[PDB]
Amino acid sequence: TVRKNQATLTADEKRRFVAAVLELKRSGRYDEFVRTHNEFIMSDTDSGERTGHRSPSFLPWHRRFLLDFEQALQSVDSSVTLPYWDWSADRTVRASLWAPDFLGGTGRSTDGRVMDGPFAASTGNWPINVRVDSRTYLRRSLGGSVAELPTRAEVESVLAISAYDLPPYNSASEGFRNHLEGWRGVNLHNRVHVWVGGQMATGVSPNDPVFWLHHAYVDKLWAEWQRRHPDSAYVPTGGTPDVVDLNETMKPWNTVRPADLLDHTAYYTFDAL
Amino acid sequence: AAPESFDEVYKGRRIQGRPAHEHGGGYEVFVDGVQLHVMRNADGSWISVVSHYDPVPTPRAAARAAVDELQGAPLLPFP
Ligand SMILES: [Cu+]
Ligand SMILES: [Cu+]
Ligand SMILES: [Cu+]
Known about the structure:
Chain A: This is Tyrosinase. The complex is a heterodimer. Chain A is mostly helical.
């Protein structure tokens, strides 16, 4: 129930994490997470209903999605928790994240195919099934489509924004949520997707297990923001068309509200916050 | 007020756009005759399902970005 920085995992932790992810893939459960995510990324729109993305609920929706995934991992190996990837610190292809004992590295230049680590197509253990094209292998181009990951300075500038979110509660908004998501400003979360490349740059981005570590760190930064701004909280707080208000339930679960997800400590803590 | 239609061969592939599981979709894009999911952001930029975190100014730019992403691969029809 402690989420740790990936860079600190022990050998046994890396091994049990990899094995639990590979077993969810084998059993077919993994791909339904990919499919769920792609349906929301394709349906959430700036002028209409928006729940998982480009909206205030981006943060509690991904918090609950990651909890669903972590619980599924724990059903395979109850010792496993989601690690997080602090991409402001671990910002090169030589980060141990990308070593063959963890997520494997970048893809080759010819077709972007990942050639090492447990998720390489050659293993036979990571078919890409839920996809938008004929390619069935994990792809990445670390640092190919954008030169640099966000820096700590840039992260700090976003953490300093006091308002959680602002009308019109979409990709055009000012405030914390949209600057963290990245549609405005220096760009944190979106730019990391673009920096990894391959399936992480697409609507079927959970095909890459780094998805979970990226979102675990985005989730950490929300928790950091709450600490800096104890007088700020989720908005909107009632009656907003197309947007999940604080006490409204969210799809697909329908049984949980942003209000139920504001305090992460009800589900996990961090190694250091 | 939708962008104009277009039709060209980009890096050997035919890309088309026209004004018209997912959303509304007031504009359609195709790569070699397969529909590509695209979306318009509030600021007027566009993205597609194969480049969803990387806004480009126009639907033709999104189609070209998809051809770049696909590296020759056929597109599968969306949902
Ligand atoms: Cu997402
Ligand atoms: Cu979309
Ligand atoms: Cu994301």
